[PDB]
Scaffold this active site. Structure first.
Site, PDB file in Angstrom:
ATOM      1  N   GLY G  68      -6.594 -15.649 -20.729  1.00  0.00           N
ATOM      2  CA  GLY G  68      -5.802 -14.456 -20.840  1.00  0.00           C
ATOM      3  C   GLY G  68      -4.312 -14.755 -20.833  1.00  0.00           C
ATOM      4  O   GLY G  68      -3.872 -15.822 -21.261  1.00  0.00           O
ATOM      5  N   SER G  97      -9.461 -21.615 -20.566  1.00  0.00           N
ATOM      6  CA  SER G  97      -7.999 -21.405 -20.540  1.00  0.00           C
ATOM      7  C   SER G  97      -7.593 -21.062 -19.103  1.00  0.00           C
ATOM      8  O   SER G  97      -7.934 -21.819 -18.187  1.00  0.00           O
ATOM      9  CB  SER G  97      -7.608 -20.382 -21.600  1.00  0.00           C
ATOM     10  OG  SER G  97      -6.483 -19.614 -21.164  1.00  0.00           O
ATOM     11  N   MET G  98      -6.886 -19.954 -18.857  1.00  0.00           N
ATOM     12  CA  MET G  98      -6.445 -19.651 -17.498  1.00  0.00           C
ATOM     13  C   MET G  98      -7.610 -19.402 -16.545  1.00  0.00           C
ATOM     14  O   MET G  98      -7.429 -19.493 -15.324  1.00  0.00           O
ATOM     15  CB  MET G  98      -5.527 -18.429 -17.477  1.00  0.00           C
ATOM     16  CG  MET G  98      -4.391 -18.477 -18.445  1.00  0.00           C
ATOM     17  SD  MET G  98      -3.183 -19.698 -17.936  1.00  0.00           S
ATOM     18  CE  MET G  98      -2.861 -19.199 -16.251  1.00  0.00           C
ATOM     19  N   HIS G 122      -8.413 -26.497 -22.734  1.00  0.00           N
ATOM     20  CA  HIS G 122      -7.705 -26.186 -23.970  1.00  0.00           C
ATOM     21  C   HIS G 122      -7.145 -24.768 -23.906  1.00  0.00           C
ATOM     22  O   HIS G 122      -7.801 -23.850 -23.401  1.00  0.00           O
ATOM     23  CB  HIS G 122      -8.676 -26.346 -25.152  1.00  0.00           C
ATOM     24  CG  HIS G 122      -8.110 -25.977 -26.494  1.00  0.00           C
ATOM     25  ND1 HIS G 122      -8.534 -24.878 -27.212  1.00  0.00           N
ATOM     26  CD2 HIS G 122      -7.105 -26.530 -27.217  1.00  0.00           C
ATOM     27  CE1 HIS G 122      -7.834 -24.783 -28.328  1.00  0.00           C
ATOM     28  NE2 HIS G 122      -6.964 -25.776 -28.356  1.00  0.00           N
ATOM     29  N   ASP G 165     -10.054 -29.480 -28.629  1.00  0.00           N
ATOM     30  CA  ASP G 165     -10.566 -28.115 -28.718  1.00  0.00           C
ATOM     31  C   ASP G 165     -12.054 -28.150 -28.389  1.00  0.00           C
ATOM     32  O   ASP G 165     -12.903 -28.219 -29.280  1.00  0.00           O
ATOM     33  CB  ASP G 165     -10.301 -27.567 -30.117  1.00  0.00           C
ATOM     34  CG  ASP G 165     -10.746 -26.111 -30.303  1.00  0.00           C
ATOM     35  OD1 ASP G 165     -10.401 -25.545 -31.367  1.00  0.00           O
ATOM     36  OD2 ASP G 165     -11.418 -25.529 -29.414  1.00  0.00           O
TER      37      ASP G 165
END
Lengths: 189, 6, 185, 189, 188, 190, 189, 188, 6, 6, 6, 6, 6, 6
Positions: G68, G97-98, G122, G165
Site C-alpha cells: 500500500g 511490499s509494505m 519487491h 520481481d
C-alpha cells in the site's frame, strides 16, 4: 438485503441474534460466494474464535462458492490445518477451484456434500496484484501438493484432472478423494 | 445440517 | 424501502420485530426475487433454523421468483429434501425457472398457488458446454420425480417458451391445490 | 429522507414508532409509488399480519401509485381476496394501471378517493423477465376479468376504455364502478 | 446532513428526539425541497397522525419548496382539506409551483410568509408517467380552480397570471390572495 | 466520516452526545459548507428550537462557507431577524456570498472573525437558484441582497453595489471597517 | 459484509461484540488488505489503545496484505517501534511490499508465518501526492535501511533482493531475516 | 470499514466507546488525510470541546495529512491560536502543505514527529470555488507569515524554501524550526 | 396464508 | 382518513 | 415560528 | 493463533 | 469560542 | 503516544 432476527431459549432471558450469528453459536461457519481477503479474514476470525471456545468440539464449515483469490484461499486452508478441532465440510450448491480445496481439507470422514452439488478443481481462467509467470506456476504447484495430500492421489493424477475443464458430481468427487459422504437425508440404519 | 454436522 | 415494525404479546412482556422476522416466527420463509447464492444461503439458514426449533412442525415457503442461478436453486432444493419437516409451498405472483422447481419440491399435497399466478418450467435463455447440459439433465430429473411425469414429457414442456395457469400447473403435476379463499370444512 | 419518530402515551407506559409503523399499528397499509416484487412482499406481509391480529377488523389500504409489475400487482390483488377482512381502499393523488386495479378490488362500498385524484385503467406500453407475445395477452386478459368483476361491467366495455390513453376524474371512476364514494370532507351519517 | 439530537424534558423524565421529530411534537410539518410521491407520503402521514392526536389544535406547515410532481402536490392539498384542523402555512425562502398552492391552501387568515421569500404560481417547463396532452391540460385546470378558490380571484385572472414567468414578493402574494400576513418580527 | 461521541455529566447522567449535538446544547449552530435548502432547513430548525428553550440566551452561529442558494440563505437571514435572541456570528475559514450575508446579520456588536478568515461580498457567476430563473428575477434577488448588506453595514446602496462588483476577498480588518463584522479576535479578550 | 456477533461470558452477565472487536480484546490487531492512511489510522489507534491497557503484555498483528501507501506503512512501522510492547507478527495469506515490511518489523523471535503464505519485498511500480524523482528515491532508501535493520542483511543484499520481481516461500523469508518461525501446527512445549 | 469498539473499565466503567471516541477522551484530536471544510469543522469542534472541559490540560494533535484546502487549514490554525491549552503536535506518516503548517503551529517545545515521517512546506500546484490571482497570493502570503512566526525564520528563507518541490526528513524539519523533537521511543 | 399454510 | 377509513 | 405559528 | 500468538 | 461566543 | 503527548 435484510437479515432476519431469531430469539433463542434461554438461560438469561432470551437474546435475539441475526440469523448468521446464531449459526455461529452452533459452531457453523458459512463460506459463501467468491473468496477474497475480506472473506478469508472473517472465516479465519470465526475459526480462531470457535477454537478458543473449545479446541475439542467439531467445527462445521458449509461451502457454497465458485472460488476466489488463491492466497486468500490458502490463508483459510492453513488456518484449518493449524487449529486442533475436527472440521466437517459440507458442500451446498457448488465448490469450484479454491472452494473445492477448502472442502477437501476437512478432517477425513467428515467431508460431505448434498446430492446435486457441483465440484470443480480445474481452476480459472484471481490475484490481489500481478504477477510473474514463475509466481503463478509456484502458486499452482502449491495447489497440486495440497490436493494430492488430501485426496491421496498422485501429482500427475491431480495435474491431469485439473487440466480438464469440467465439474464432478458429488459421487465422482468422492471416488477421487475430495468427499467422503453424499447424503440425501440424515443417516443411520 | 444435524445429524451429523452438527 | 423501509420495512415496518410490529408489536407482539409473547409469553412474557412485549417483543418488537421487523415484519419479516415476525413472519419467520410463524415458520414462514419468503423466497422473493431472483435466486442467487446470497439468497440461497439466507433461505437455507432459515430452513435449518426452523427444523432445529421443531423436527416436525410444517415450514411454509412463500414463493415469488423469476428464477435465478441454477446451483443456488439446487442448493435450496437439496436442503428441502434433507430437512425432515413437511414443507408447504405457496406461489404468489409467479414461479419461473428455479422458482417453479422449488414450488414443485414441496412435500406432496401441500403445494399451492393463488388464482392469478404464473408458472414457468422453461429455462430462460460461465461454464463449458457439457456442464450446461449436465446441469439441465439435473433439472429434468428433479421435475420428473416431483411431477410424476416421465423424462420425455418434461424435456418437451421445458422447451415451450410459455407460462401455465395455476390449474394447468396442477394438471401437469407441479402443484396440488389452487385456492381463491380458505377452504370450507 | 429520515422518517419522523412519534411517541404514544398509550401504552401502558409509552412506545416510539417511525410514523409508518405507527400507521400500520392502526391497520393502515400504505401503497406508494411503483409496484414491484418488493412492494408486493411488504404489502402482502402487512396484509397477512393485520389479518392474523383480527380477521374481522377492517384493513385500510392507501394507494398513490402509477402502476407497476403486473405479476406483483396480481399477487397483492389475490391476497386481498384470500384474506377475510373488509378492505377500504383510498386513492390519494393517483391510481394508474395496477394501482387502480388494487383500488377497485376493495370491498364494495368501501372504495374511496380524494377529490383531485387521477384514475387510469389504461395499461402503459413491465414484467420481470422479457416475455412472449402469447403470454402478454394472457396477462392482459386476466386484467380484463378482474376489472370486469369489480366494476360490474362487460369484457367488451373494459376492453374499450382500456384502449383510451386517458385518466378519469374520481367522479367518472365512480360511475364506471372503480370506486364508490369520493369524499372532500368526512361525512356526517 | 447529520441530523442533531436534542433532549427535552417531558413526562416523566427526559427523552431524546432528532430535531425534526421534535418539531413534529409541536404540530409542525416541514415541506422542504421538490415535492414528490415520497414527500407527499410523509407529509400526509404526519397530517393524518397530528389530527389523530387532536382534531382541534392548529397544524403548522413550514414551506420552502420550488415545486414538484403535480399529483403528489394534489394528494397533500386534498388531505389538507379533508382533515378538520386549522392549518397555518408559513413560507421561508420560496414557494413556487405546487409549493405556493399548498401555501395558498392554509386556512384563511393563517397563511404567512417571511419578508424575503419568493412566490411563483407559474408552472415550470410534474407527472410520474409521461402523459397525453389532454391529461396535462386537465391538471392545469385543476390547478386553476384551486388557485381561484383560495385567492378569491377569477379563473381568468388566475390563468393570465400563471402565464407570467415571474415571482411575486410576499406583499404582492398577499394582495393577490395567496398570503394573509407578511411578518418580519412576531406581532405584539 | 466518523463523528465522535462525547460524554457529559448532569443531574441524571451519564449521557452520550455526538460532538455536534453537544455543541448545539451550548447554543452553537454550525453553518458549514455550501448553503442549500437542506442546510437552510437544518439551520432554521436549530434556531427555532434554541429560541424555544430560551428567547433571551444568545445564539452562536459559526460560519465557514463559500456561499450557496440565494433563496436558502435568505430563509436563514429572515429567521435570524424573526427570533428574539441576540445572535453572535463567528467567521472561521471564510464567509463568501450568502455566507458573509449571514455573518453581517448577527446582532450589532456581536459579529466576529478569526484573524486569517477571508470575507467576500461579491456573488458568483455550486448553484445559486433551485429552478432556472429569468433575468428580472435574478435582478430582484440581487437588489434584495443590496438592501440587506446596506442595512447591516450602514453603507449606502451605491457603496454596496460598487463593492459587490469587485471580484475580491477582504481581510477581517477590511470587513470590519466596511461594516460586515465588529471585532477581529486572535485570542479571547481580557 | 455482515460481521457476526459473538457473546462472551466473562462475566458479570454476558456482553456481546462483533467478532473483530472481540479479537481486539485478546490484543489482536488485524492488518487486512491494502494499507492506506485510513488503515494506518485504525491500526495506530489500536496499538496505542492496547499499550494503555498494558505496557507489557504482547500485541499480535495478523497480516494479510498486498502492500500500500508507503508513508502510511511507515506511520504504522514507526508506531510499532515506539510502543513499549513486544509485537508478534503473524503472516496469513501474503505480506507483499509494505505488508512484508510490517511482518519484518515485529519483535525479533516473534515473527511468524503460516506454511503457504507468500512474502514479497519487491515494491510495485503508492503515494498521496505525485512527488519528484528525488523524493521517491528517498522513500525507497528509507525502505532499504528498515529492511536492513530488521533482517540484519547488507544494503547491497537488500537492494539487490528488492530488484527481483518475485515472492518468497516463508522458509526462504526466514533464512533471509524477514521472519523467525514457520508453523503448520502449534509447537509442543 | 469496521471501526472496532472498546469497553472501558474505570469506575462505573462499561460504555462501548468506538476507538476514535475513546482517543478523544484522552484529549487526542486525529487529523488524518486531506483537510477540507468538513475535517476543519470536526477538528475545531473537538478542540473547542476539549478546552471547554479543561482550558489547562494539554491537547494532542496527531497529524498524518497530505494537505488540503488553505482556508480550512487556516480555520484550524486560528482555532489552535485562539484556545488557551498547550497543544502537542505529533506527525506520523507525513505532514505536507497545510498539514505541516498545523504541525509547526503547536506550542513551542511540544512539536514532535516519529522518525520516518515526511514534512513538506511546498504548496501543491486547494480552494472552495476558484479565485482571482491577487487572491491566491494573499492566501500564500498568509502562509509565509505563519510559517515565519513559528519557524522563527525570515520571509526570504521561507519563500525560498517553499519554492523547492521537496520533502524534509524530521531532523531537517526540526533544524528548520517546524518541530522541536524527533522521537524513536519515549524518552527517559 | 391461514388456513392451511399456516 | 377517519371517519370512515378508519 | 412562535408566536403565532405556534 | 494460540499458542503462541496468543 | 468562549469567551465571548459563548 | 505517552509519554509525553499524553
Amino acid at each position: 438485503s435484510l437479515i432476519p432476527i431469531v430469539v433463542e431459549q434461554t438461560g438469561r432471558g432470551e437474546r435475539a441474534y441475526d440469523i448468521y450469528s446464531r449459526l455461529l453459536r452452533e459452531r457453523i461457519v458459512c463460506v459463501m460466494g467468491p473468496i477474497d481477503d475480506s472473506v478469508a479474514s472473517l472465516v479465519i476470525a470465526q475459526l480462531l474464535f470457535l477454537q478458543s471456545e473449545s479446541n475439542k468440539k467439531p467445527i462445521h464449515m458449509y461451502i457454497n462458492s465458485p472460488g476466489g483469490v488463491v492466497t486468500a484461499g490458502l490463508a483459510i486452508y492453513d488456518t484449518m490445518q493449524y487449529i486442533l478441532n475436527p472440521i466437517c465440510t459440507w458442500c451446498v450448491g457448488q465448490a469450484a477451484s479454491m472452494g473445492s480445496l477448502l472442502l477437501a481439507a476437512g478432517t477425513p470422514g467428515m467431508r460431505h456434500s448434498l446430492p446435486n452439488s457441483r465440484i470443480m478443481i480445474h481452476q480459472p481462467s484471481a490475484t490481489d496484484i500481478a504477477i510473474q509467470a514463475e509466481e503463478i506456476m509456484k502458486l499452482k504447484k502449491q495447489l497440486y501438493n495440497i490436493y494430492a495430500k488430501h485426496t491421496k492421489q498422485s501429482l500427475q493424477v491431480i495435474e491431469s484432472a485439473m487440466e480438464r475443464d469440467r465439474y464432478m458430481s458429488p459421487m465422482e468427487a468422492q471416488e477421487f478423494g475430495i468427499l467422503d459422504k453424499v447424503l440425501v437425508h440424515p443417516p443411520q440404519d | 445440517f444435524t445429524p451429523x454436522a452438527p
